[PDB]
Amino acid sequence: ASITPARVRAHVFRYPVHDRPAVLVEVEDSDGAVGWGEVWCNFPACGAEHRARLVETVLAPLLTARAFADPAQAFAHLEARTAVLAIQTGEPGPLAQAIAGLDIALCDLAARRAGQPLWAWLGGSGDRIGVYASGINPENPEDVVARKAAEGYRAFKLKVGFDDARDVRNALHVRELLGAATPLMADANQGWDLPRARQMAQRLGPAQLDWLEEPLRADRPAAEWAELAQAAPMPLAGGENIAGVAAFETALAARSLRVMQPDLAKWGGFSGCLPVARAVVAAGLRYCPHYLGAGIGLQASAHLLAAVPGLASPGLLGVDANDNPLRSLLSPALATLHEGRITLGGAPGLGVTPDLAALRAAC
Amino acid sequence: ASITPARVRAHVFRYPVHDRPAVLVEVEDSDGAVGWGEVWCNFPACGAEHRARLVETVLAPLLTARAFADPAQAFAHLEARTAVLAIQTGEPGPLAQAIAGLDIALCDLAARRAGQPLWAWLGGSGDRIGVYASGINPENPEDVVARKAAEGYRAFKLKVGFDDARDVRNALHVRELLGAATPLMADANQGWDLPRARQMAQRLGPAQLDWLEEPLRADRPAAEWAELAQAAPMPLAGGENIAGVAAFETALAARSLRVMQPDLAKWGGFSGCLPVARAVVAAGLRYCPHYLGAGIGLQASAHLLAAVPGLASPGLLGVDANDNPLRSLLSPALATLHEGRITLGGAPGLGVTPDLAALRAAC
Numbered sequence A, B: 001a002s003i004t005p006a007r008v009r010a011h012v013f014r015y016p017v018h019d020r021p022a023v024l025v026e027v028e029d030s031d032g033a034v035g036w037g038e039v040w041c042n043f044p045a046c047g048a049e050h051r052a053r054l055v056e057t058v059l060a061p062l063l064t065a066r067a068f069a070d071p072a073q074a075f076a077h078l079e080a081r082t083a084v085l086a087i088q089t090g091e092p093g094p095l096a097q098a099i100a101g102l103d104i105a106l107c108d109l110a111a112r113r114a115g116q117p118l119w120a121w122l123g124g125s126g127d128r129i130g131v132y133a134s135g136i137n138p139e140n141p142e143d144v145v146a147r148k149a150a151e152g153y154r155a156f157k158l159k160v161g162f163d164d165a166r167d168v169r170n171a172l173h174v175r176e177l178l179g180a181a182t183p184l185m186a187d188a189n190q191g192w193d194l195p196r197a198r199q200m201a202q203r204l205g206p207a208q209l210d211w212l213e214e215p216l217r218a219d220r221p222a223a224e225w226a227e228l229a230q231a232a233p234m235p236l237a238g239g240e241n242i243a244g245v246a247a248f249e250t251a252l253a254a255r256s257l258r259v260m261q262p263d264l265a266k267w268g269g270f271s272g273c274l275p276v277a278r279a280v281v282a283a284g285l286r287y288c289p290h291y292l293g294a295g296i297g298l299q300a301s302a303h304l305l306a307a308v309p310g311l312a313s314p315g316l317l318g319v320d321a322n323d324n325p326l327r328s329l330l331s332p333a334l335a336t337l338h339e340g341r342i343t344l345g346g347a348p349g350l351g352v353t354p355d356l357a358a359l360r361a362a363c
Helices: A047-065 A069-078 A083-089 A092-114 A141-151 A164-178 A196-209 A222-231 A245-254 A268-283 A295-307 A333-336 A356-360 B046-062 B071-080 B083-089 B092-113 B141-151 B164-178 B195-205 B222-231 B243-253 B269-282 B294-306 B333-335 B356-362
Strands: A003-014 A021-031 A034-038 A128-136 A158-159 A186-187 A211-213 A237-239 A257-260 A316-320 A342-344 B008-015 B019-028 B034-038 B126-138 B155-159 B184-185 B211-213 B236-238 B257-260 B316-320 B341-343
Touching: A003 A047, A003 A356, A021 A047, A021 A083, A021 A356, A021 B356, A034 A164, A034 A222, A034 A295, A034 B184, A047 A092, A047 B046, A069 A092, A069 A268, A083 A092, A092 A268, A092 A295, A128 A141, A128 A186, A128 A295, A128 B083, A141 A158, A141 A164, A141 B356, A158 B294, A164 A186, A164 A196, A186 A196, A196 A222, A196 A316, A196 B341, A211 B257, A222 A237, A222 A245, A222 A257, A245 A257, A268 A295, A333 A342, A333 B164, A356 B034, B008 B046, B008 B356, B019 B046, B034 B294, B046 B071, B046 B092, B071 B269, B083 B092, B092 B269, B092 B294, B126 B141, B126 B184, B126 B243, B126 B294, B141 B155, B155 B164, B164 B184, B164 B195, B184 B195, B195 B211, B195 B222, B211 B257, B222 B236, B222 B243, B243 B257, B257 B269, B269 B294, B294 B316, B294 B333, B294 B341, B333 B341
Parallel strands: A128 A158, A128 A316, A158 A186, A186 A211, A211 A237, A237 A257, B126 B155, B126 B316, B155 B184, B184 B211, B211 B236, B236 B257
Antiparallel strands: A003 A021, A021 A034, A128 A342, B008 B019, B019 B034, B126 B341
16 A cells, blocks of 8 residues: 655654754554654764755655555655755765665654554565674773673674774773684774785784674775775775765775665655665675664664675674663664664564653653 | 954845845954955755854864965965865755855955955056846836846846746847847856757757856766757856865866856855956856845955956856845945946945944844
């Protein structure tokens, strides 16, 4: 059955730690069914309100003007109808992020209406996936690692790109503290230039990392990346800052990044990321999503990972290691964490319906 | 005399007509001196608040933490220090715009301190410039053209791209009305694909247009612009949606566009646009800016055009044809409009200081 959006809304939340912002969107069909989704908005710090405004004043009008055979058709329609606007305003990101969020909501709506958990609706056959503690801070990792390993995590990702000396210390130390079986990862957030990247890569090798994330700016020429891949001892990862089928297609063909990390709440949602995840896995590469926002986006990625678990190189879902009620409050699956894994269950859709009253009461 | 920003505030205004938005910025010197600027924000309709937030939460701190030899240096610092944030968020536009507005204010501040009108500061030798009624709607062109002619306008630009047949009717009709010596332009706002532009550029030929603006999306590969440029009877114009030094060099390298129109409030400000505007005129091409925002940005554009008069063909500053107090209450140069031309006078800086209190009241 087709989807006829009748009411579309965006809700902004901000939990103070600076705070953790969140943009939740809800789509209501004319017949009453409802779907929920999240819009990436960690940066800038003030972008949450703008993204929510985009959803209500730009996208919503387009969504409630007709019907759509399914989420994918609505995605293409919203992309096509804002292409020029994106060029006029220079806001490819905000528009992509608002559209991604809306796509998760529509898929949630569709799946909830079909009576299937999102992972099944997406073609998956299992609901259990592994995870990893993402974003561990450079202060003293081994400390936060232990807490998480206690919570049930069996994979961790340290943050480097600050002080070459310190970072290398944390990597090797945590490696020793964990053992040799535990997968360990590092994220530099586009913090290095080619020269420094080549060096840190080499220096990190002993840490036996599963991958080195964004060692360079996504901006850098493909050629610089190619050179770093060859030179580096571990596989490179990126995707958080890649958007569009063409962009992912180019990175995929280059094979400089052996771990692709598309963020469904930042671009494409399910309609866009499902096919790129499939392209990555089929190319022999590794698909490992991550979401550092509220629970809805996390649940969403969990369902997608379940639908595309990888073959020879299974994938893990990155869960923000930093405290944040906006995640644990809207991500029931995290309660199943046991032995580095979680199970999504069979609740139709995302498996979570935000309690708005309760969310603002936590803010 | 170096610049040492101390306080940077952004004020948003929305004049109900849905409504005309505006974001004015004021940078206060360490000596108490003040400079004013404008940050482009026509689209999306909800984008004004976000841009003002960017100025106060992201650019202000960078700006007020050090000193700068001149505005150009502060400009280069702001771009470099936000390059990565642009990637992470996909907001190259909002950031460029906020940056451009702040450059306009730093230059305004510098010109005032030197006791000079911005045009003189930019190294200009005259203050008299031509203008054109810009953005006449397709419904009844002959009517508003008559009205604007009565107001003092001796050049006009029509909006096209909606309906092929009606557009060529309007184009030719308005040409008849105006006679022949009167400059006539047309703006398609990236509304056509290559084969349609070729077709229309041909059918418009008899209107004897001075230039066809944005016939294709700014996105299109050089090959499509190169082809259209050859097939078109009139020259092509663009710039509204070209940002960055590298993008203009590319446009310049091809010369498909013979009329370059950088929007100093959208990108680069004076620090960025003066060089490209001078480069355009020296390369034997026309530099015809236009500002459809509020008065501050328009005055800023008039000054730049005065500083870069033109050699081959006299540059023309485009003024919004529709009513907007946000523009009229802040652009006194218009009160000198006589025989399709205005003069900036010797008043320091932009030649105007906004009356926030008054403006809010008018809203």
